[PDB]
């Protein structure tokens, strides 16, 4: 099947005033809108699937667009379960907090992004993500590895409705490994009324051997909307 959404996400820093607004090198690439290419690779439960993905995205107003297909037929999970690891350099920080944006300071070279996601009372999804520029293009190259799934389990049974809410993505720096990690819960929406819990672990590594920035602790505030 395809998959469209559109995905809006701003820094928001409490403390880090000292030297707030220094802005790195990287953040050059992302002053006008930018193109992006998606490619999943995933095995859930042993069940194949690709996702591909063409967009564009403008850091300016922290917003992208990106339009999916599947080469591979229908899903084996909901599109919902995907989006989180279907680029968050195009997030939009505030002038006086751009010292906080590591995404951005990675480029053109990239960074890596691992997750755990676990759904709760069911499996868990493995992630690795290659996230860097090729030409003019920022590439998302992604392998999914999801296991212990529930076969009547809100995932594989495809109970989850076709929207996203709003998160918190609560960024720390790393500084033993050059970058950063994040934690945060995404709230999935069942057919039931009920919600479905994904606790996302997350790990960026910058690719290249060049200084990034290194956060204050802070969050990016996250909204999508699916069609």
Do not use: C
């Not at 002053?31 to 690709?50: A, M, Q, R, W, Y």
């Amino acid at each position: 099947s395809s998959h469209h959404h559109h995905h809006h996400s701003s820094g928001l820093v409490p403390g880090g005033s000292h030297m707030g607004g220094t802005s790195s090198k990287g953040e050059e690439l992302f002053t006008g809108v930018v193109p992006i290419l998606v490619e999943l690779d995933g095995d859930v439960n042993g069940h194949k699937f690709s996702v591909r993905g063409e967009g564009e995205g403008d850091a300016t107003i922290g917003k992208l667009t990106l339009k999916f297909i599947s080469t591979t037929g229908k899903l084996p999970v909901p599109w919902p379960t995907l989006v989180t690891t279907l680029v968050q350099a195009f997030s939009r920080y505030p002038d006086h907090m751009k010292r906080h944006d590591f995404f951005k300071s990675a480029m053109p070279e990239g960074y890596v992004q691992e997750r755990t996601i676990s759904f709760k009372d069911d499996g868990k999804y493995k992630t690795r993500a290659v996230v860097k520029f090729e030409g003019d293009t920022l590439v998302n190259r992604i392998e999914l590895k999801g296991t212990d799934f529930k076969e009547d389990g809100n995932i594989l049974g495809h109970k989850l409705e076709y929207n996203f809410n709003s998160h918190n993505v609560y960024i720390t720096a790393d500084k033993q490994k050059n970058g950063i990690k994040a934690n945060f819960t995404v709230r999935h929406n069942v057919e039931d009324g009920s919600v479905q819990l994904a606790d996302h672990y997350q790990q960026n590594t910058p690719i290249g051997d060049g200084p990034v920035l290194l956060p204050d602790n802070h969050y990016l505030s996250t909204q999508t909307k699916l069609s």
